[PDB]
A paper describes a structure:
The [name] is a AAA+ protein found in prokaryotes, archaea, and eukaryotic organelles. [name] is involved in cellular protein homeostasis by degrading damaged or misfolded abnormal proteins, which prevents these unwanted protein species from forming toxic aggregates. [name] is known to form a homohexamer; each protomer is composed of multiple domains, including an N-terminal substrate-binding globular domain (NGD), a long-helix domain (LH), a three-helix bundle (3H), a AAA+ ATPase module, and a protease domain. We show here, using cryo-electron microscopy (cryo-EM), that the activation process of the [name] AAA+ protease may involve a pentameric assembly and a substrate-dependent incorporation of the sixth protomer to form the substrate-pore-loop contacts seen in the translocating state.
To provide a comparative context, we also examined wild-type [name] in two states: without any nucleotide ([name]-Apo) and incubated with 5 mM ADP ([name]:ADP). Additionally, our cryo-EM structures of a series of spiral subcomplex oligomers of [name] determined by 3D reconstructions suggest a sequential pathway for the construction of the THT. In the proposed pathway, the THT is formed by sequential incorporation of the protomers, beginning with Ob1 and progressing in the clockwise direction through Ob5, and completed by the incorporation of Ac6*, whose binding mode is dependent on the substrate.
Numbering used by the authors:
A (entry chain A), B (entry chain B): 243 to 774
C (entry chain C): 477 to 635
Amino acid sequence: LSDLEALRKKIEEVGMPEAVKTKALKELDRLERMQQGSPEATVARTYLDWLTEVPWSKADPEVLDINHTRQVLDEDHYGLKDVKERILEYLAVRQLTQGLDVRNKAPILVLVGPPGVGKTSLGRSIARSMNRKFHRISLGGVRDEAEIRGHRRTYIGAMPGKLIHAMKQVGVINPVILLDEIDKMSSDWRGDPASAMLEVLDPEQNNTFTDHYLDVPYDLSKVFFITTANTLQTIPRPLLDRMEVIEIPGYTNMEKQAIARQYLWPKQVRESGMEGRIEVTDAAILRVISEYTREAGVRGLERELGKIARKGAKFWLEGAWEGLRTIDASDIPTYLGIPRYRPDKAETEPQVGTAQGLAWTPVGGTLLTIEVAAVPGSGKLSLTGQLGEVMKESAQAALTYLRAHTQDYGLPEDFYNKVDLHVHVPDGATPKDGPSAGITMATAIASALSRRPARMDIAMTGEVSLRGKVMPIGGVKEKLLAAHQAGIHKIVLPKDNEAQLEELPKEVLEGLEIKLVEDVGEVLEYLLLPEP
Amino acid sequence: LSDLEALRKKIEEVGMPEAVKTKALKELDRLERMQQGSPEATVARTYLDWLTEVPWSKADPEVLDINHTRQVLDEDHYGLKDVKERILEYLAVRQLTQGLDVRNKAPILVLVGPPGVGKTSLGRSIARSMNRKFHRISLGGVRDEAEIRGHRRTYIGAMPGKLIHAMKQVGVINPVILLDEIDKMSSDWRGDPASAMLEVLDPEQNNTFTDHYLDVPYDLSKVFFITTANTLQTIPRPLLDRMEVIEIPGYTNMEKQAIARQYLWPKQVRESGMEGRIEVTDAAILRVISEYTREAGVRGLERELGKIARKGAKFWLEGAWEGLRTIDASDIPTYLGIPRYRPDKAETEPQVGTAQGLAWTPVGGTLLTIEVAAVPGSGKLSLTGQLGEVMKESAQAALTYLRAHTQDYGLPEDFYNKVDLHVHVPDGATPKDGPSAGITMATAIASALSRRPARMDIAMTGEVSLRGKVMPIGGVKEKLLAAHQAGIHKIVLPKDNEAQLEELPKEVLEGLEIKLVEDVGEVLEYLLLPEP
Amino acid sequence: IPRPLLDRMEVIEIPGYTNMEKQAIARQYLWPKQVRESGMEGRIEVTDAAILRVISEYTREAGVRGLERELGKIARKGAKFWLEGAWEGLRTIDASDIPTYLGIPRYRPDKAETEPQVGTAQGLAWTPVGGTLLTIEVAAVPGSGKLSLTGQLGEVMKE
Ligand SMILES: Nc1ncnc2c1ncn2[C@@H]1O[C@H](COP(=O)(O)OP(=O)(O)O)[C@@H](O)[C@H]1O
Ligand SMILES: Nc1ncnc2c1ncn2[C@@H]1O[C@H](COP(=O)(O)OP(=O)(O)O)[C@@H](O)[C@H]1O
């Protein structure tokens, strides 16, 4: 109203395109009118201000040193040392990540892994090395283009989408932006946000992306995007373009202990301001890993170590008497209350029909159990979790296997006409291709129908054939890592997954007991205590 | 005239950062426009006033010892059992982290608890401990970021958000800002104010928190924020980093009586100007708490004892009869009318099919009167109460268990496909969204389909799994507090939680009589009044 | 009422009056008030039957506001029928000549004459504009079995 004349000068002082200037002129002749009593004038001035608020004509340094990135991803993060090779061979070779634009294979370098892993920390580290401003943005709960693109501006209360809004929070026009929680954009509310990402997906088409608040193709030419794929089950098929998948698996107990001892506990002590007045034994950290965090990464362990540090700080505020205290495993419960988990599952006191499996979850590899009961009925079958049909088909295959071998393991002669079965699975959706732990359900059905107990110390995963074969499956290494974190030793694995076994770290191949199998009956006889 | 000179003197006396001072002086130089017309020299005057009365570089003495906070929590507060420690821990952390290491650190004590139980009193005592100012900010009905951030400062009719008002009323820049009821926000009208909370509420972004009525972002790098929500299942996920919860559970009736005698009833006596003129016997106090209030926390006691004080004021003021009155449990209805709630739950004459379990509702822990109609039909379980399939899944698991124990409880030989079931659960989707009261619905179904009275005054809480084992349930404190709210002495708890149970304070222990269980076959032994 | 304005509030509930209380308040203060309001000073007599007729046939709002309006109408028609001549020293209005001074009775005397209907029930509620019935009605069509709320009420009524 009063500064508009100055606003008239403020437009072209900072470099803006000329179509933007044309639409600003179209929205500019509408001035010289009262604002109050006219919300259209208010939203018009909001648009005029936004024409300047959005970033224009800035830059970031072009440093892409191979050795700098190597050191930044090496010394800061004691973990990795293997995926760092992959990101090196990708980026150091990749002069087409940005700066150079061609119509060829330029993948957006998706990051896949459980929430606990430091893929986001990898984003922080690579952004620090590249010296391009970092900003994540949440995408879960977003299913609308109007929630990602601008809100159509016709009345007061219109704002651009969180993409442009986030790019306003930074002071550059060529950033590297992590897209946190990019797993839940479903085309069910006002179009497909996947299409908005698709125009963004290309390194040159995003330069033509037009908002809805603003109506000009915005400049996305030298902007890199990296996406956090927390889910390891399914990917958006339209987003298949320009993919080279980068996956972060689970962590070994050795690696978790080392990372806790070297670059997480020191910073946790630092956040409390201590100079090292608290020390923790290695066995204490082992107990914290085992009996306090049943996760796939170090996210929960960070919180637990913070709890320990805060308890130590409060105890030290009771008086100045500590040159240094070492917190061994003896007094751990005095800082974290009751131990929240078992040291291992050797005290399970084997159940009857219950089995244990390795399921595919958005938190990556995870140990889970499957429960089945033989209730009288008409041989019907019930499931849990509104399951994907992959596990339903696995259950049907298990039933077919157990119908032809009723007399091989003392199963009832007709259990498909007189006894119904209720089956529970903690993870129901299973967008992962095929049943992740179908053989676990097969074992559970066999144990439940056998009217015999079943050992609970042994995890397994894979699929069953209609002929009783133990099918191969991907991600076996992650499930082995998850079982190792819980300490489950005897792991049953398909004979077809020897390739997955070779790449396992030597910290895994020693403390477990692998069991290569190709028939369901073998797995049945290696867990069921009595055969008849 | 002299008004501009006075404003110049005021802006000279008041200090602020250099950019703010320079731009305020420039907009002061931008005066002399039409005062008695459209806002061009008046909104500028309002801007200058806003910049002059919002405080800059004004603070309070801070905490330098946990001993003073120890005393302020011991006296003028009943102690609050396990929450004696957590606040002291956090304050120790804050005291030790005063060497300017709070940025991107120092979480803010989200205080989850029912409105009745002392939360704002905790904040008031804490503020008194450090000698800080106090000011609440109600955010239970906020839907606009402009109610938090400002608004475009170009016209008259738009004021800054609640935060700027609260900073203005407080004479210093680092008060104890208590954000009321933050969880119950919504995003229905324009925008989403969740990002406003994210920016204001995190250090290293509070100084980055932007204002809109004042174009200059204001710095909250010193405010000891504290936030009291009621539900952890509704706060936005981004508002969980640096958000450590200090949970405040309900109260036992013994604690209610002990605090009524000390802080509540004497406050009412001082309120109605009846100092040392009327007494109340502890029998009357326990009658009041057990018959007139059925809420977690002691806010109801405030109203009830205020009513008693007012009635005493009227009865005295129509003529004194002695110097110190008295009252017992036999004449409470003379002062509060009909006792709304039964003094004891042993006189409930157990009903036919309905069971009653425990739940931690956000308003306060209470009992779900889970009702079951075993209407004859074709066999189906329709579950009302605005609930997801998690309640339906717990229902199906319990139904499976009873199907495994048909003849063990007089149940029909087949009832999954013979009698339809209606299961009304009054909003079981409360915090801990999902089945945390599966055994309650299990015994409800057992009573309903066995035509045997589900014993009342035994309020249970637990989980039923497909096999039948009663697995542990999180939060074995809120459940017991809700158990003792309704004056229930008999409680059924999973055995796997007894290790947690031993950690509970003696106030919740002695007043309750726990009969630990590990199966459903033993739960149906307690609450079935007859043997069959 | 706003929650910020609900603290430090003590509620003093004043629901509507009762029919005999309505007669009593009309006889004690309302009727003399309106009689001196119009300009009449004691030459009109009104029987209690006429008062009850006014109350139960021309007012359904809780209280006396509608009664105030109806009694003002009575006073103004009395201004008619005394202004053109003092025919009588104290004119008496019974239940018979109440529509000569007012409109047609717009409400029934008693609800007992409702002649019970096949498929309707008479509810109760306190709508914050005044108490009222909830004449909830339902229907039974031969179909396949399904419930349909109608009236834009909450799902609790469907429950
Ligand atoms: N592979 C890894 N190597 C080193 N550190 C890791 C690794 N994975 C996780 N971390 C640690 O986990 C912590 C949390 O990182 P991050 O997940 O990026 O933060 P946020 O949880 O806020 O996204 C970091 O401090 C990082 O040191
Ligand atoms: N130990 C205590 N526990 C609960 N309430 C208390 C305690 N001590 C005092 N009170 C009183 O209970 C009232 C309710 O406190 P609180 O719940 O914090 O505020 P609000 O009810 O406004 O949320 C306070 O006014 C306080 O005077």
